[PDB]
Ligand binder design. Sequence first.
Ligand SMILES: Cc1cnc(Nc2ccc(C(=O)NC3CCN(C)CC3)c(F)c2)nc1Nc1ccc(Cl)c(NS(=O)(=O)C(C)(C)C)c1
Length: 127
Amino acid sequence: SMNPPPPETSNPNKPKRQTNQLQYLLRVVLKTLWKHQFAWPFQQPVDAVKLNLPDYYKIIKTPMDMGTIKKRLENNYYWNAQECIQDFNTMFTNCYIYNKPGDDIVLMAEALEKLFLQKINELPTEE
Ligand SMILES: Cc1cnc(Nc2ccc(C(=O)NC3CCN(C)CC3)c(F)c2)nc1Nc1ccc(Cl)c(NS(=O)(=O)C(C)(C)C)c1
Protein backbone atom coordinates (compact mmCIF):
# COMPACT_ATOMS: atom_id res chain seq x y z
CA SER A 1 0.00 0.00 0.00
CA MET A 2 1.50 3.22 -1.39
CA ASN A 3 3.24 6.09 0.40
CA PRO A 4 1.69 9.56 0.33
CA PRO A 5 3.67 12.61 -0.72
CA PRO A 6 5.66 14.05 2.20
CA PRO A 7 4.45 17.01 4.22
CA GLU A 8 4.98 20.41 2.67
CA THR A 9 8.40 22.00 3.23
CA SER A 10 8.30 24.84 0.72
CA ASN A 11 5.66 27.48 0.11
CA PRO A 12 6.67 30.92 -1.16
CA ASN A 13 3.31 32.48 -0.29
CA LYS A 14 3.28 31.32 3.31
CA PRO A 15 4.22 34.11 5.67
CA LYS A 16 7.26 33.13 7.64
CA ARG A 17 9.82 34.49 10.06
CA GLN A 18 13.10 33.84 11.69
CA THR A 19 12.71 34.46 15.40
CA ASN A 20 15.18 33.80 18.22
CA GLN A 21 12.87 31.01 19.42
CA LEU A 22 12.85 29.37 15.97
CA GLN A 23 16.66 29.69 15.89
CA TYR A 24 16.82 27.87 19.23
CA LEU A 25 14.51 25.18 17.85
CA LEU A 26 17.05 24.50 15.08
CA ARG A 27 20.37 25.07 16.85
CA VAL A 28 19.46 23.40 20.14
CA VAL A 29 16.32 21.29 19.88
CA LEU A 30 16.58 19.73 16.40
CA LYS A 31 20.36 19.40 16.59
CA THR A 32 20.20 17.62 19.96
CA LEU A 33 17.55 15.14 18.88
CA TRP A 34 19.08 14.56 15.44
CA LYS A 35 22.44 13.39 16.77
CA HIS A 36 20.91 10.99 19.29
CA GLN A 37 21.46 7.24 18.83
CA PHE A 38 17.69 6.70 18.55
CA ALA A 39 17.05 9.49 15.99
CA TRP A 40 17.36 7.43 12.82
CA PRO A 41 13.80 5.99 12.60
CA PHE A 42 12.51 9.57 12.85
CA GLN A 43 14.93 11.27 10.41
CA GLN A 44 12.68 10.83 7.36
CA PRO A 45 9.07 10.02 6.50
CA VAL A 46 8.02 6.46 7.28
CA ASP A 47 8.39 4.34 4.15
CA ALA A 48 5.36 2.16 4.75
CA VAL A 49 6.03 0.21 1.57
CA LYS A 50 9.59 -0.85 2.47
CA LEU A 51 8.55 -1.54 6.09
CA ASN A 52 5.46 -3.47 4.96
CA LEU A 53 3.02 -1.37 6.99
CA PRO A 54 0.08 -1.02 4.61
CA ASP A 55 -2.09 0.36 7.43
CA TYR A 56 0.36 3.09 8.47
CA TYR A 57 -0.97 6.03 6.44
CA LYS A 58 -4.46 4.74 6.93
CA ILE A 59 -4.05 5.27 10.71
CA ILE A 60 -1.62 8.19 10.75
CA LYS A 61 -3.32 11.01 8.87
CA THR A 62 -1.02 13.84 9.95
CA PRO A 63 2.44 12.35 9.45
CA MET A 64 5.50 14.16 10.70
CA ASP A 65 9.20 13.38 11.02
CA MET A 66 12.42 15.19 11.87
CA GLY A 67 13.60 15.23 8.26
CA THR A 68 10.57 17.36 7.41
CA ILE A 69 11.09 19.52 10.51
CA LYS A 70 14.77 19.99 9.63
CA LYS A 71 13.86 21.16 6.11
CA ARG A 72 11.16 23.47 7.46
CA LEU A 73 13.62 25.08 9.90
CA GLU A 74 16.40 25.34 7.29
CA ASN A 75 13.95 26.95 4.85
CA ASN A 76 12.55 29.27 7.56
CA TYR A 77 9.11 27.83 6.77
CA TYR A 78 7.49 28.60 10.11
CA TRP A 79 5.79 31.75 11.39
CA ASN A 80 6.38 30.97 15.06
CA ALA A 81 7.92 28.52 17.51
CA GLN A 82 4.59 26.94 18.45
CA GLU A 83 4.10 25.77 14.85
CA CYS A 84 7.41 23.90 15.01
CA ILE A 85 6.80 22.58 18.54
CA GLN A 86 3.50 21.22 17.25
CA ASP A 87 5.34 19.31 14.51
CA PHE A 88 7.56 17.62 17.12
CA ASN A 89 4.52 16.74 19.22
CA THR A 90 2.67 15.36 16.20
CA MET A 91 5.69 13.13 15.51
CA PHE A 92 5.75 11.78 19.06
CA THR A 93 1.98 11.37 19.34
CA ASN A 94 1.86 9.56 16.00
CA CYS A 95 4.39 7.09 17.32
CA TYR A 96 2.34 6.37 20.41
CA ILE A 97 -0.90 6.15 18.39
CA TYR A 98 0.40 3.64 15.86
CA ASN A 99 2.53 1.41 18.06
CA LYS A 100 2.18 -0.71 21.21
CA PRO A 101 3.43 0.29 24.64
CA GLY A 102 6.91 -0.99 25.30
CA ASP A 103 7.74 -1.48 21.61
CA ASP A 104 11.31 -0.55 20.71
CA ILE A 105 10.11 2.33 18.52
CA VAL A 106 8.08 3.72 21.45
CA LEU A 107 11.11 3.51 23.78
CA MET A 108 13.10 5.40 21.15
CA ALA A 109 10.46 8.10 20.84
CA GLU A 110 10.22 8.42 24.63
CA ALA A 111 13.96 9.04 24.92
CA LEU A 112 13.82 11.73 22.23
CA GLU A 113 10.70 13.26 23.78
CA LYS A 114 12.35 13.50 27.19
CA LEU A 115 15.19 15.52 25.68
CA PHE A 116 12.76 17.58 23.63
CA LEU A 117 10.83 18.54 26.77
CA GLN A 118 14.01 19.43 28.63
CA LYS A 119 15.12 21.73 25.80
CA ILE A 120 11.79 23.45 25.26
CA ASN A 121 11.56 24.09 28.98
CA GLU A 122 14.37 26.57 28.33
CA LEU A 123 12.95 28.12 25.17
CA PRO A 124 14.13 31.74 25.32
CA THR A 125 11.62 34.57 25.65
CA GLU A 126 10.91 36.08 22.24
CA GLU A 127 13.19 39.00 21.38
C1 LIG B 1 8.64 6.66 13.12
C2 LIG B 1 8.11 5.28 13.20
C3 LIG B 1 6.89 5.07 13.86
N1 LIG B 1 6.37 3.84 13.98
C4 LIG B 1 6.97 2.76 13.46
N2 LIG B 1 6.46 1.52 13.60
C5 LIG B 1 6.84 0.31 13.09
C6 LIG B 1 6.05 -0.78 13.60
C7 LIG B 1 6.36 -2.06 13.12
C8 LIG B 1 7.38 -2.30 12.16
C9 LIG B 1 7.57 -3.67 11.72
O1 LIG B 1 8.70 -4.00 11.28
N3 LIG B 1 6.48 -4.50 11.58
C10 LIG B 1 6.32 -5.83 11.01
C11 LIG B 1 7.61 -6.69 10.96
C12 LIG B 1 7.23 -8.12 10.50
N4 LIG B 1 6.52 -8.14 9.18
C13 LIG B 1 6.31 -9.50 8.59
C14 LIG B 1 5.36 -7.18 9.07
C15 LIG B 1 5.69 -5.76 9.59
C16 LIG B 1 8.14 -1.19 11.66
F1 LIG B 1 9.09 -1.40 10.74
C17 LIG B 1 7.87 0.15 12.12
N5 LIG B 1 8.15 2.92 12.80
C18 LIG B 1 8.75 4.13 12.67
N6 LIG B 1 9.94 4.26 12.00
C19 LIG B 1 10.77 3.24 11.64
C20 LIG B 1 11.69 3.49 10.60
C21 LIG B 1 12.58 2.50 10.19
C22 LIG B 1 12.55 1.23 10.81
CL1 LIG B 1 13.66 0.04 10.30
C23 LIG B 1 11.64 0.97 11.86
N7 LIG B 1 11.64 -0.27 12.45
S1 LIG B 1 11.44 -0.60 14.09
O2 LIG B 1 10.30 0.29 14.67
O3 LIG B 1 11.14 -2.13 14.16
C24 LIG B 1 13.01 -0.28 14.93
C25 LIG B 1 13.38 1.22 14.77
C26 LIG B 1 12.80 -0.65 16.41
C27 LIG B 1 14.09 -1.18 14.27
C28 LIG B 1 10.77 1.98 12.26
